[PDB]
Write an enzyme that holds these catalytic residues in place. Structure first.
Site: not given
Ligand SMILES: CCCCCCCCCCCCCCCCCC(=O)OC[C@H](CO[C@@H]1O[C@H](CO[C@H]2O[C@H](CO)[C@H](O)[C@H](O)[C@H]2O)[C@H](O)[C@H](O)[C@H]1O)OC(=O)CCCCCCCCCCCCCCCCC
Ligand code: CLA
Ligand code: CLA
Ligand code: CLA
Ligand code: CLA
Ligand code: CLA
Ligand code: CLA
Ligand code: CLA
Ligand SMILES: CCCCCCCCCCCCCCCCCC(=O)OC[C@H](CO[C@@H]1O[C@H](CO)[C@H](O)[C@H](O)[C@H]1O)OC(=O)CCCCCCCCCCCCCCCCC
Ligand SMILES: CC1=C(C/C=C(\C)CCC[C@H](C)CCC[C@H](C)CCCC(C)C)C(=O)c2ccccc2C1=O
Ligand code: SF4
Ligand SMILES: [Cu+2]
Lengths: 31, 42, 93, 99, 146, 154, 743, 73
Positions: D37, D84, D87, D92
């Site tokens: 991430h 993010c 994502h 996200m």
């Protein structure tokens, strides 16, 4: 008394066993 | 010389030379007029 | 067959085709009569093809049905049921 | 204030998505599930000054390993929206405000 | 391709993010990353070393469909003669062993027919295809419910 | 405009993308020496990007909400430079290639061993033949009208 | 009987007549092409010398000359390497600060916006990062400037020219005769001593004089340009005396047998150098010295001309026991008249050797600053693994070729081979059983773990925390290795490698070089998977070799040849009964096995070895040790390995690694494309080509050379080639992108 | 229950009775307000039957009986 408990083994173990035995006997022998 | 010419025109060799020349020509055209997405002259 | 190098004769085709028993005993029963006289008497009712097949099938089926329909909670977690409150879906539930 | 990157179910979201923190605090972005991430700060809709590289991660870096944290001290009045990069298309996107 | 297109368009519309599809559909890497890889996290996390959730059944099926399909590649690539010779040596071995040669097969074992092998390979291919895609679609749409 | 798109010259997301691209390119430049070979290369690339975006705005391309140029191929005369005159150019070149190759095949079809002249290209004949593709649009037209483009009896 | 030099003059006169005629070797091919199939055949049998003729002398001469040509190609490749390192590389910048700069020796011209690939590699340079590990080799050799690299490149070019001339001269001017090639005793003596032993002695001599003093100066912190040139250390000897005092006496310890005095630079330390993270160069020099002695002795075994020595025939025929009849009698004649036998033996040995090289090279890194160059380590391991696997499969291919073509019991009879051919059925049946048993217990355990995890029963799983399958034997062996130095091998200070144990983690520049590798249940499972795959591929290859000539299905399979499509749809179907098809399947299974091996290596290294050290000594591993708990299920391999680590490659767009993403997608495409050939048959394609050819005939544009569809065997070959290319290339791109972005 | 609030309850297909399930699986699969593990229907039969007029379980039982008779016929 729980109806599913009786039938799930009946249809998943007894029924395939008897059916496979019977069909093996039928397919596999001279008539 | 004559046999050198003959072998130098066989399918693989001729094709590679032709495609090298074509690649060079296209490369130079792109270099002079890069990032061309339309024909603006007319 | 076996005269010198011959390995073929029509008189004895069984020997020619290797129809032997590599390990057949051909020896008398190692059991004394008394033990056999018990086993052959108490295991007699299980030596019929159709009878044994039908009895095995139905008895095993009934045994399975009884043992599965009357299982205790420490046996199968499926039928013991959930013991926690249910969560909600992202928007459904 | 700790926030986990990615949900337990593999959802690509922050834990909590919206962070209301007080100044004098720094956010630690710990990895949970769905990693690698990355947390990148918007650079737009962001208060007055605050240069982007100070609180961003390189748009080409990713946190690895189940338990890796990213440390950002923040400390500037206003709200910051972070997201993010990998994502960001899966929702996200988060937001931190310091009142 | 038809169902990939439909599902990606609708999953991006249901999120109010039709733009994302508009940007990433033009190139194939967008399809590979923003659709297959991106929408496949909850499904593969259906069960993990830290427990399982309601999507585990799909995560299992997702792998099941991957296996069937892959074993389909078997019957499609390897052909009959190899298997026939292998079965011949297997028959020799069974006939040459103690205590098991007392049991005798009644139909001579043979490798699958050429047409039959093609059919079985195609059936595996199709079943794996369908099962893996159904698992993916249902888990990804139901995972978000949106 | 057409299909709800707007001209790239007055579009805003197009300009934003242009600025972001130049910013990304410049980010790398500040790391090296001001006048080193890598710095010169990066500067040349930045100038190339600026020229590209200016040219795209100049030609009057259409930009969507994504901020990227879109090509109109319906036939609108305002966009013939996007697909139709390049299409005509491609058709000319491809017909040149095909006509030259067909002429070569027909020319070498009369020998006792035509395959020999196919794996070993008879360059002398090919050099004479390649120039027929300048006027193939006329040769093919009269070939069709004269009725010997297509093999009869087949 | 005697060994001497025999040649023939001007066997073939150099000319261009045969260049103009495609396919001079085969008469029908020489006649000309009738259909397009001809063309393919012309390439399929280019190097099949034993089929164009039957004379052993001609085959041997062609083989020797082709060897010279390939050696020339290799020399040209090496010269290119050295030149690119000399001119288009940042070698000196990397030399000044190894850990800081990322090695790179390739730049791309700016033409179509591809200049983005010229990434920031450090050292004021922009190029493509190289994972070949050449920089480490050059540093270990003592190369400090680009003048030396230029000189090496020029010398390699000259040697490539010399190799090419040697090939021409030996095939056209002076071609050795058959008795010269059949002289294997002298050949073995020279290769053991003249090549390996003498070459190792030469390299040890270089290391003592150039590698040791130069690397000592480099590790002392001296700037590379301030170091004395490698030749100075030879002129003035006090230069060497300063670094290692024992050079003062000079050779007299060597001749008085006071060899202990050479302990300064000839050590038996073991382990890794804590500064550079590689093996002690004073250990490598001693290594090569001992190897030179051993090979120079071993190359004095076989008799050539002076009576003393061993006759290989005598050694072979002296071995035979009650279980093998007269075994080894007749093998000498088999191995000196058939090239395919030798080729298969050598291919098997070279493949195994390459695999061992990979294992030992990541076990204890031998080059400085190589252990912490994770990309280099991963790439080298994977490359050598693939090369070895391919060579091993080729071994089976050529064993089967020999069996079909050159095996002849009427003239060259061997007893062991006869017995193997006589109980091949038992061999293959037992191998089949072993394969099934391994497959069930290795993969079945994975499926069991997956099913238990899906059902919420982690207590029933085969894991380190539920039901443990501890590799007790491997743990015991590596424990015995850890205790080895000072107990069973007193002369060594550190264990052979840091993977055995003993702690003593070694790190360089804030990165972990090496540390003990633990073996658990996941390691047990993956090792059994490896065994299963190797056994299945061995089954395929061995069955192809043994049943090449005949079987219970086709009793005359040899008459059809080594390569042929089938024997018709009779007997139920005889598809892929030839040995070539067995090699074709063995290729797929070798790909499977090697892919699993490299995946295991990569994930284990990332999870439990590679990582970053910190001030307190806390190692943060690239992957936080998830291999032990996640690798025991297929879902973990799909999620925590493929999905997690594909993020690096898929995101590479817009950066210097975009080429890796492009190759990722392209490899996927080519792999899927192969299935087109692997799943279909040529009948459909020929029927379709009929309609296409008709469409061409309608316009008087049909080719004279009739376009036929590919042959069946060619269809299989194309399918397998594309499959292997696509799979291996996608894995290549994945590994390189992942380890360059995360390393 | 579904007809009471069609938008905020997941339709149930059928119950699960699997002796291989573990306790956490039984916990995770009990949804829709059921007393045990159940499956969430995605065939869309709930919406279809709701639209045509079926409201109670009695209607479904009558339909099932009628269809059994129909198959017998
Ligand atoms: C600006 C405003 C004014 C514009 C005026 C423009 C004029 C056209 C452009 C240039 C004219 C000058 C060209 C150079 C002069 C020599 C050309 C020539 O006569 O060279 C001689 C050839 C011969 O032409 C014909 O060539 C045909 C094919 O013959 C031969 O073709 C080959 C020739 O090498 C081989 O010999 C082959 O075996 C054989 O078939 C015919 O059968 C006859 O031989 C012959 O009539 O002309 C050829 O096309 C040679 C190939 C080049 C032709 C270029 C034409 C233009 C395009
Ligand atoms: C084809 C329609 C169909 C389908 C797909 C299913 C599927 C299922 N039923 Mg079910 N069932 C059906 C019709 C159907 N049923 C009918 C019409 C009745 C009578 C009203 C029942 C009564 C019933 C009971 C009492 C139970 C199930 C249960 C179950 C589940 C577990 C397996 C089982 O017990 O076997 C099925 C058990 C039976 C007693 C079925 C008998 C009824 C039909 C007529 C048998 C058909 C046999 C026929 C030769 C083959 C049909 C053609 C083809 C599909 C092969 C399973 C998901 C169990 C459960 O609740 O899951 C937890 C359970 O206990 N069913
Ligand atoms: C330098 C001049 C020269 C000339 C005029 C010839 C001429 C001839 N050679 Mg000869 N040869 C030469 C040099 C030469 N050779 C050298 C330097 C070697 C050492 C390698 C050989 C070794 C050799 C052998 C072993 C044989 C011949 C044979 C022959 C005759 C058959 C046709 C032929 O050459 O093959 C075709 C011409 C080619 C150019 C084929 C290509 C071969 C090169 C090496 C490929 C390069 C590899 C490339 C890097 C692969 C990567 C692919 C990548 C680029 C995509 C012919 C009269 C054959 C013969 O006499 O038959 C009885 C024979 O068997 N030659
Ligand atoms: C159907 C597939 C297809 C199509 C239609 C295009 C079309 C285009 N590509 Mg492209 N490309 C493709 C596949 C395709 N590509 C593939 C598969 C790759 C991977 C190898 C590439 C990689 C690629 C690159 C790297 C670039 C392009 C570029 C271009 C544009 C450049 C036009 C030009 O060269 O100026 C005009 C050329 C001519 C006018 C030459 C003809 C003139 C003749 C010689 C004279 C005739 C006289 C009468 C153009 C719109 C370039 C670009 O800038 O994109 C905008 C560029 O940089 N392509
Ligand atoms: C000191 C003796 C010696 C040495 C060093 C070699 C070395 C080599 N031989 Mg050789 N050989 C020898 C004696 C020797 N041989 C004898 C006495 C015989 C007759 C029984 C043979 C018969 C023979 C055959 C049939 C073949 C070889 C081959 C090879 C090469 C194997 C591939 C390799 O590892 O490349 C290593 C590369 C290098 C070490 C680079 C440097 C190469 C140098 C210049 C080699 C020079 C050694 C040579 C023998 C010098 C004599 C020639 C002189 C008149 C100039 C290798 C270079 C194979 C080959 O052709 O090579 C591809 C092969 O087919 N040899
Ligand atoms: C030193 C190693 C070595 C040597 C000397 C040989 C030598 C030989 N082999 Mg052999 N082989 C080897 C290793 C070796 N092999 C290995 C490792 C394998 C396992 C893969 C095989 C498997 C094998 C088979 C199955 C066969 C042979 C055959 C042959 C003979 C004829 C080969 C030929 O010219 O056909 C023609 C050669 C070609 C058409 C070249 C193929 C081009 C490849 C497929 C492309 C490579 C792609 C590249 C790496 C990447 C893409 C680049 C591209 C995009 C530009 C010949 C004597 C044949 C035979 O009949 O034996 C008598 C045969 O059937 N070999
Ligand atoms: C996912 C794809 C797949 C799978 C699963 C297999 C599986 C297998 N291959 Mg194979 N192969 C494949 C792809 C695949 N292949 C492809 C694409 C090719 C083309 C190159 C080949 C070419 C090939 C060759 C040439 C050969 C094999 C062989 C084998 C068998 C080796 C024996 C073994 O492992 O024992 C055990 C089996 C397994 C471990 C497979 C999974 C078994 C599971 C875990 C057991 C589950 C049991 C479960 C309780 C059943 C209950 C369900 C009930 C309702 C019926 C094995 C069954 C070799 C062989 O036949 O062995 C002699 C052989 O020679 N394959
Ligand atoms: C059982 C496994 C084993 C292995 C693999 C080794 C391996 C080794 N030992 Mg060792 N050793 C062992 C058991 C083992 N030892 C045991 C059980 C003892 C008694 C406790 C010793 C006592 C011992 C001593 C005292 C020394 C070694 C040394 C060595 C190293 C040099 C070997 C040598 O001298 O060349 C071969 C020598 C020969 C004479 C050839 C004969 C080969 C045998 C006897 C057959 C080598 C790495 C030497 C060392 O210090 O290494 C630097 C050394 O000094 N070992
Ligand atoms: C602008 C794009 C369109 C261009 C159309 C070109 C003209 C097409 C009509 C004429 C075609 C033609 O004459 O050939 C017609 C061609 C054959 O061509 C015919 O061949 C005959 C036998 O040799 C005669 O020579 C005729 O003169 C000739 O026209 O056949 C057809 O295409 C079928 C159409 C009906 C006739
Ligand atoms: C494996 C394989 C075999 C051998 C396959 C065999 C011997 C089949 C053995 C399977 C056994 C019988 C168990 C299969 C279990 C099935 C799930 C049971 C299905 C039976 C009914 C339910 C339909 C071939 O004969 C063959 C032939 C031509 C091309 C490819 C192949 C091929 O790939
Ligand atoms: S399908 Fe092909 S390989 Fe198989 S028997 Fe027929 S022709 Fe031979
Ligand atoms: Cu994320």
């Amino acid at each position: 008394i729980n109806l599913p408990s009786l039938f799930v083994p009946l249809v998943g173990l007894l029924f395939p066993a008897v059916a496979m035995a019977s069909l093996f006997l039928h397919v596999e022998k001279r008539l | 010389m004559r046999d050198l010419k003959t072998y130098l025109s066989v399918a693989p060799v001729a094709s590679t030379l032709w495609f090298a020349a074509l690649a060079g020509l296209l490369i130079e055209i792109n270099r002079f007029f890069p990032d061309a997405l339309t024909f603006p002259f007319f | 067959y076996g005269d010198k190098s011959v390995y073929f004769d029509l008189e004895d085709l069984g020997n020619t085709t290797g129809q032997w028993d590599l390990y057949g005993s051909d020896a008398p029963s190692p059991y004394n009569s008394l033990q056999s006289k018990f086993f052959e008497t108490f295991a007699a009712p299980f030596t019929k093809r159709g009878l044994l097949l039908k009895f095995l099938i139905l008895g095993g089926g009934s045994t399975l049905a009884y043992f599965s329909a009357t299982a205790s909670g420490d046996i199968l977690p499926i039928k013991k049921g959930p013991q926690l409150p249910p969560q909600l879906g992202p928007r459904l539930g | 204030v700790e926030v986990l990157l990615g949900a337990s179910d593999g959802g690509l979201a922050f834990v909590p998505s919206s962070l209301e923190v007080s100044a004098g605090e720094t956010i630690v972005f710990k990895n949970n599930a769905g990693f690698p991430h990355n947390v990148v700060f918007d650079e737009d809709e962001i208060p007055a000054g605050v240069d982007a590289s100070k609180i961003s991660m390189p748009e080409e870096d990713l946190l690895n390993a189940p338990g890796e944290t990213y440390s950002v001290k923040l400390d500037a009045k206003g709200t910051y929206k972070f997201y993010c990069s990998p994502h960001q298309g899966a929702g996200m996107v988060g937001q931190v405000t310091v009142n | 391709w038809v169902t990939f297109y439909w599902h990606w368009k609708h999953i991006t519309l249901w999120q109010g993010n039709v733009s994302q599809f508009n940007e990433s559909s033009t190139y194939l890497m967008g399809w590979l990353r923003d659709y297959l890889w991106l929408n496949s996290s909850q499904l593969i996390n259906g069960y993990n070393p830290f427990g399982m959730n309601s999507l585990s059944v799909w995560a299992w099926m997702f792998l099941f469909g991957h296996l069937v399909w892959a074993t389909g590649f078997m019957f499609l690539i390897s052909w009959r003669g190899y298997w026939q010779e292998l079965i011949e040596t297997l028959a020799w071995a069974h006939e040459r062993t103690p205590l098991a040669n007392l049991i005798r097969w009644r139909d001579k074992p043979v490798a699958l027919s050429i047409v039959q092998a093609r059919l079985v390979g195609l059936v595996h291919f199709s079943v794996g295809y369908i099962f893996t895609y159904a698992a993916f679609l249902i888990a990804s749409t139901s995972g978000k419910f949106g | 405009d057409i299909a709800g798109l707007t001209p790239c010259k007055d579009s805003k997301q197009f300009a934003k993308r242009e600025k972001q691209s130049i910013k990304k390119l410049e980010s790398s430049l500040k790391l090296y020496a001001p006048d080193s070979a890598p710095a010169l290369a990066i500067n040349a690339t930045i100038e190339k990007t600026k020229r590209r975006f200016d040219n795209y705005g100049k030609q009057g391309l259409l930009c969507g909400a994504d901020g990227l140029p879109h090509l109109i191929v319906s036939g609108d005369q305002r966009h013939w430079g996007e697909f139709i005159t390049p299409g005509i150019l491609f058709l000319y070149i491809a017909g040149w290639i095909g006509w030259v190759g067909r002429s070569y095949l027909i020319a070498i079809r009369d020998d006792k061993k035509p395959t020999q002249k196919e794996i070993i290209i008879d360059v002398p004949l090919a050099t004479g033949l390649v120039f027929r593709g300048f006027s193939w649009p006329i040769a093919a037209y009269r070939e069709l009208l004269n009725g010997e483009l297509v093999a009869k009896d087949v | 009987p005697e060994v001497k030099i025999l040649v023939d003059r001007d066997p073939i006169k150099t000319s261009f007549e045969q260049w103009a005629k495609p396919g001079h070797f085969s008469r029908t091919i020489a006649k000309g092409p009738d259909t397009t199939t001809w063309i393919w055949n012309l390439h399929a049998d280019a190097h099949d010398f034993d089929s164009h003729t039957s004379d052993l002398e001609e085959i041997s001469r062609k083989v020797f000359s082709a060897h010279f040509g390939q050696l020339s190609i290799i020399f040209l490749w090496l010269s290119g390497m050295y030149f690119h390192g000399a001119r288009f590389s940042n070698y000196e910048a990397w030399l000044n600060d190894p850990t800081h700069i990322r090695p790179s020796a390739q730049v791309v011209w700016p033409i179509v916006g591809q200049e983005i690939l010229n990434g920031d590699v450090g050292g004021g340079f922009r190029g493509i990062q190289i994972t070949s590990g050449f920089f480490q080799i050059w540093r270990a050799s003592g190369i400090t400037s680009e003048l030396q690299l230029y000189c090496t490149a020029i010398g390699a070019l000259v040697f490539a020219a010399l190799m090419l001339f040697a090939g021409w001269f030996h095939y056209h001017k002076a071609a050795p005769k058959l008795v010269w090639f059949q002289d294997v005793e002298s050949m073995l003596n020279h290769h053991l001593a003249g090549l390996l032993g003498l070459g190792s002695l030469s390299w040890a001599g270089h290391q003592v004089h150039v590698s040791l003093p130069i690397n000592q100066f480099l590790n002392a912190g001296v700037d590379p340009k301030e170091i004395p040139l490698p030749h100075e250390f030879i002129l003035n000897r006090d230069l060497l005396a300063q670094l290692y005092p024992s050079f003062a006496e000079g050779a007299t310890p060597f001749f008085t047998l006071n060899w202990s005095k050479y302990a300064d630079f000839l050590t038996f330390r073991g382990g890794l150098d804590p500064l550079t993270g590689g093996l002690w160069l004073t250990d490598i020099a001693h290594h090569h010295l001992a190897i030179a002695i051993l090979f120079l002795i071993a190359g004095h075994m076989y008799r050539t001309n002076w009576g003393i020595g061993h006759g290989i025939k005598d050694i072979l025929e002296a071995h035979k026991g009650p279980f093998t009849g007269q075994g080894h009698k007749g093998l000498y004649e088999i191995l000196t008249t058939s090239w395919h036998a030798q080729l298969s033996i050598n291919l098997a040995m070279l493949g195994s050797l390459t695999i061992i090289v990979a294992h030992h090279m990541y076990a204890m890194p031998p080059y400085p600053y190589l252990a912490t160059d994770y990309g280099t380590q991963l790439s080298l391991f994977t490359h050598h693994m693939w090369i070895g696997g391919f060579l091993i499969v080729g071994a089976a291919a050529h064993a089967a070729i020999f069996m079909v073509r050159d095996y002849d019991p009427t003239t060259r009879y061997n007893d062991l081979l006869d017995r193997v051919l006589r109980h091949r059925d038992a061999i293959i049946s037992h191998l089949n059983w072993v394969c099934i048993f391994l497959g069930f217990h290795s993969f079945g355990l994975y499926i069991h773990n997956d099913t238990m995890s899906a059902l919420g029963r982690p207590q029933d799983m085969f894991s380190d925390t539920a039901i443990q399958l501890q590799p007790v034997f491997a743990q015991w062996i590596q424990n015995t290795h850890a205790l080895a130095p000072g107990t069973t091998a007193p002369g060594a200070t550190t264990s052979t490698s840091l993977t055995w144990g003993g702690g003593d983690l070694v790190s360089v520049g804030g990165k972990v070089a090496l540390l003990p590798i633990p073996l658990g249940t996941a390691d047990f499972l993956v090792h059994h998977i490896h065994a299963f795959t190797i056994h299945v591929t061995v089954l395929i290859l061995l069955k192809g070799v043994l049943f090449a000539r005949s079987s219970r299905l086709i009793p005359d399979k040899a008459n059809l040849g080594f390569r042929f499509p089938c024997d018709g749809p009779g007997r139920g179907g005889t598809c892929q009964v030839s040995a070539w098809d067995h090699v074709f399947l063995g290729l797929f299974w070798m790909y499977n096995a090697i892919s699993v091996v490299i995946f295991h290596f990569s994930w284990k290294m990332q999870s439990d070895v590679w990582g970053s050290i910190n001030d307190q000594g806390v190692v943060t591993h690239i992957t936080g040790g998830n291999f032990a708990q996640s690798s025991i299920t297929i879902n973990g391999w799909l999620r925590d390995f493929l999905w997690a680590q594909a993020s690096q490659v898929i995101q590479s767009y817009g950066s210097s690694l975009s080429a890796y993403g492009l190759f990722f997608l392209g490899a996927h495409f080519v792999w899927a494309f192969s299935l087109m050939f692997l799943f279909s048959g040529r009948g459909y394609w020929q029927e379709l080509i009929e309609s296409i050819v008709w469409a061409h005939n309608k316009l008087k544009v049909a080719p004279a050379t009739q376009p036929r569809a590919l042959s069946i065997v060619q269809g299989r070959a194309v399918g397998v080639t594309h499959y292997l290319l696509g799979g291996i290339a996608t894995t290549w791109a994945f590994f390189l992108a992942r380890i360059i972005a995360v390393g | 229950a579904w007809v009471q609030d069609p938008l905020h309850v997941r339709p149930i297909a059928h119950a699960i009775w699997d002796p291989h399930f573990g306790q956490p699986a039984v916990e995770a699969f009990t949804r829709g307000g059921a007393l045990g593990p159940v499956n969430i229907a995605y065939s869309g039969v709930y919406q279809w039957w709701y639209t045509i007029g079926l409201r109670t379980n009695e209607d479904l039982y009558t339909g099932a009986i009628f269809l059994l008779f129909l198959s017998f016929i």
